[PDB]
């Protein structure tokens, strides 16, 4: 899983 | 990388079960930072993608908006521009995303499951704190879906 970092 | 790779990159999110890929959002965003001269084209594409993608993907559509939106927003504060009226500017792009963000949010929250509905709430918090979109717009959203 290549996720989106909320930053 | 040219606009066709932006389209192709964005078209490829359809083969992702989650609809989320940080590398590709980082590709789009880097591209968005190098092609503000054609931001109007980039913007309606990512605006339209959120309207048309499948239901489980709507969070990632809003992730792409968050990623490009908050990098364009970081430019206007480093550059002190509010050209909300001038095409080809970061100020204009955010103004464009803002005029449609509620319709995008009502639809994204509506068509998500409880898990993704939660993560949209997290997004509303960051935008509320970043100043990305007008707080009144997010409040209308929060008052009807998250409360
Ligand atoms: Cl700017």
Summary, kept brief:
Chain B: This is Protein NRD1. The complex is a heterodimer of chains A (7) and B (147). Chain A is low in regular secondary structure and 7 residues long.
Question: What features would you describe in this structure?
Answer:
Chain A: Interacts with RAD2, RNT1 and RPB1. Binds to multiple snoRNAs. Chain A: Belongs to the DNA2/NAM7 helicase family. The complex is a heterodimer of chains A (7) and B (147). With 7 residues, chain A is low in regular secondary structure. In chain A, 0% of the residues lie in helices and 0% in strands. Chain B starts with a helix and ends with a helix. Chain B is an all-alpha fold and 147 residues long. Chain B has a single domain (1-147), classed as Alpha Horseshoe (Serine Threonine Protein Phosphatase 5, Tetratricopeptide repeat). In chain B, helix 3 runs antiparallel to helix 4, helix 3 (39-52) packs parallel to helix 5 and helix 5 packs parallel to helix 7 (135-145). Chain B has helices spanning 3-11, 22-34, 39-52, 58-79, 90-110, 114-130, 135-145. Chain B contains seven helices and no strands. At the A-B interface, loops of A face helix 2, helix 4 and helix 6 of B. Bound molecules: chloride ion. Residues 75-76, 79, 81, 90 of chain B line the site of chloride ion.
């Amino acid at each position: 899983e290549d996720p989106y970092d909320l930053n | 990388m040219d606009f066709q790779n932006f389209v192709a990159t964005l078209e490829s999110f359809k083969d992702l079960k989650s609809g989320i890929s940080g590398s590709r959002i980082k590709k789009l965003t880097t591209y968005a930072l190098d092609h503000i001269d054609i931001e109007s084209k980039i913007i309606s594409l990512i605006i339209d993608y959120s309207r048309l993608c499948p239901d489980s993907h709507k969070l990632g559509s809003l992730y792409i908006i968050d990623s490009i939106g908050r990098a364009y927003l970081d430019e206007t504060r480093s550059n002190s521009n509010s050209s909300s009226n001038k095409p080809g500017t970061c100020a204009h792009a955010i103004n464009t995303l803002g005029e449609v963000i509620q319709e995008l949010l009502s639809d994204a929250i509506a068509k998500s499951n409880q898990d993704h509905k939660e993560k949209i709430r997290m997004l509303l918090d960051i935008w509320d704190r970043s100043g990305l979109f007008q707080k009144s717009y997010l409040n209308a959203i929060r008052s009807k879906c998250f409360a």
